[PDB]
Amino acid sequence: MLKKNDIVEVEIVDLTHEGAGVAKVDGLVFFVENALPSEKILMRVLKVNKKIGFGKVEKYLVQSPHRNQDLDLAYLRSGIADLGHLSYPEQLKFKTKQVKDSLYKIAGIADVEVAETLGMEHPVKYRNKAQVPVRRVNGVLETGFFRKNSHNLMPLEDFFIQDPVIDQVVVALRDLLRRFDLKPYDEKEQSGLIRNLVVRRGHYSGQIMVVLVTTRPKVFRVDQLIEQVIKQFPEIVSVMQNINDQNTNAIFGKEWRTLYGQDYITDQMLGNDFQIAGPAFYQVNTEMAEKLYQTAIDFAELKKDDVIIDAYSGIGTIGLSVAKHVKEVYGVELIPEAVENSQKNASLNKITNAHYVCDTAENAMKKWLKEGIQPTVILVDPPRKGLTESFIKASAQTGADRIAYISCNVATMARDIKLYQELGYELKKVQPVDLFPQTHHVETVALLSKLDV
């Protein structure tokens, strides 16, 4: 029976969703960082639980031909790129396999085509938004990212999967915070001023918003700091302050202040302009979010007479992306300011057939149906937990023939598919999309239809 710090020769026989190698020794299932299937390693036992254990590679005996040798290990240990040590073609095959297995094991479905995962051509340097903690590390204010399962900042300048100009702004801000003697936040002490930096840069527009996330309102000589950072980065259009005075894992507090310029940037997606506030949700991989939405559009076979419900519409990106293709878009969104933003974004693009309600999806559907609206397509991008039975039955009660389910969690998608099948919908096609390349994340578009069943 294995002990911690034992060294055992194992063959890696599987890979978890989150990118851990799997070995099976002495009745236990071991999870091993930075170890790929068919690799043979000397494994250092780090921890033994009842049915599972944890290990480390002491030495590679056989390295996989699918290993990417050039990845800095910082990106695995920060969880920035959980699959970054796997060749990109095998990353895609793995995400495809996971979708297929979920549909079979959860929904009992084995006869539906699952397309190979849509990948990114140069799957690096892509995020249009940084959220970096600011902490003192080794006595110096640093920017970086937390080690996995911790709040220990790893100082980083190159974030691998982030816009390099954003990386440069974060470094310039780091150095200005140092020159101006501004103190980083200390979670244990609840001391200091600077908690986080959020930097958004338009993928297409290059417009930059700097958010200083601070514990207190007053930031000494911040006007001179702003004066100098905009000298280095004239593309900065907004310097915002968010005050978070709470002991919480949430990034943002309630109060926002504009210190310079605008309180938003403008960026483009599928040909439309979007005004993006500090706390708005906006896909960080614009290049692949465009392909994701294009996939749902293609699956739904959108016609100019279709009436679309954009369920959980946010600041409007999905419905406004399809608005030019369909008769009417009805968006439901629970957050009123998001509805405000989606109305502004419709107006900015002169889109007049997109209408938003702030309500629950069930109540909006009830009222829309009472108003005579006859939905024909529902586009829904549920949270990780999937849809409720109430939502599924309500969406089915609308009579909508096609439902494009944009999932960030294949497991809850397969569960929801089962109920839609009981309700008379057929699962027609499935397309995984690599929305977050180099990571574990599997995004899936599923087409459900009660036509031709």
Author numbering: 1 to 453
Lines from the paper:
RlmCD is a recently identified MTase for ribosomal RNA in S. pneumoniae. Similar to its homologue YefA in B. subtilis, RlmCD can catalyze m5U methylation for both U747 and U1939 of 23S rRNA, whereas these two modifications are catalyzed by two different enzymes RlmC and RumA, respectively, in E. coli. Our structural evidences indicate that RlmCD is a MTase that belongs to the RFM family. All together, our in-vitro experiments confirmed that RlmCD is a 23S rRNA MTase specific for U747.
In this structure, each asymmetric unit contains only one protein molecule. The overall structure of RlmCDs highly resembles that of RumA with a RMSD of 1.9Å for the backbone Cα atoms. It is composed of three distinct domains representing the residues 1–63, 128–261, and 281–454, respectively. The N-terminal TRAM domain is the smallest domain formed as a five-stranded antiparallel β-barrel (β1 to β5), which is also known as the typical OB fold. The central domain comprises a six-stranded β-sheet (β6 to β11) stacked against two α-helices (α3 and α4). The C-terminal catalytic domain exhibits a typical SAM-dependent MTase fold in which the β-strands (β14 to β20) of a seven-stranded β-sheet and α-helices (α5 to α10) are connected in an interleaved mode. Most strikingly, compared with those in RumA, the linker regions between α3 and β8 (linker A) and between β10 and β11 (linker B) in the central domain are evidently longer in RlmCD. Careful structural comparison between RlmCDs and RumA revealed the noticeable differences in the lengths of the two linker regions (liner A and B) in the central domains. These two linker regions both have 13 amino acids in RlmCD while their lengths in RumA are 3 and 6 residues, respectively. Given that the overall structures of RumA and RlmCD are highly similar and that they both exhibit MTase activity for U1939 in 23S rRNA, it is quite interesting that RlmCD doesn’t possess an iron-sulfur cluster as RumA, but instead that the corresponding region in RlmCD (residues 72–81) folds as a short α-helix.
